[PDB]
């Protein structure tokens, strides 16, 4: 099913989808996309909640590599949802042209 939902970084348009950061708090804080919602790959109740708010939407679960993108998305497809997922290095988004917010744990000032 979701093999077709496997969006690559060299074809992606993060602006076109509602993005979800499927990793961890620390991972999200060190860097993330300005349209990425923090949910962990283990947060099935929180991920399914976000998808249950409206099932009719286009959401992209992006991962630092792409495996947690797949992991989280399969589990959701098994709960009767159909989210997409991004396989591509989180650090490479900026050089592919997609701006990113580094250090949002509080603010990047001292």
TrEMBL record:
This is Rhodanese domain-containing protein. It comes from the Bacteria. Signal peptide: none annotated. CDD domains: RHOD. It comes from Helicobacter pylori (strain ATCC 700392 / 26695) (Campylobacter pylori). One of its GO terms (molecular function) is thiosulfate-cyanide sulfurtransferase activity. Residues 13-102 form the Rhodanese domain.
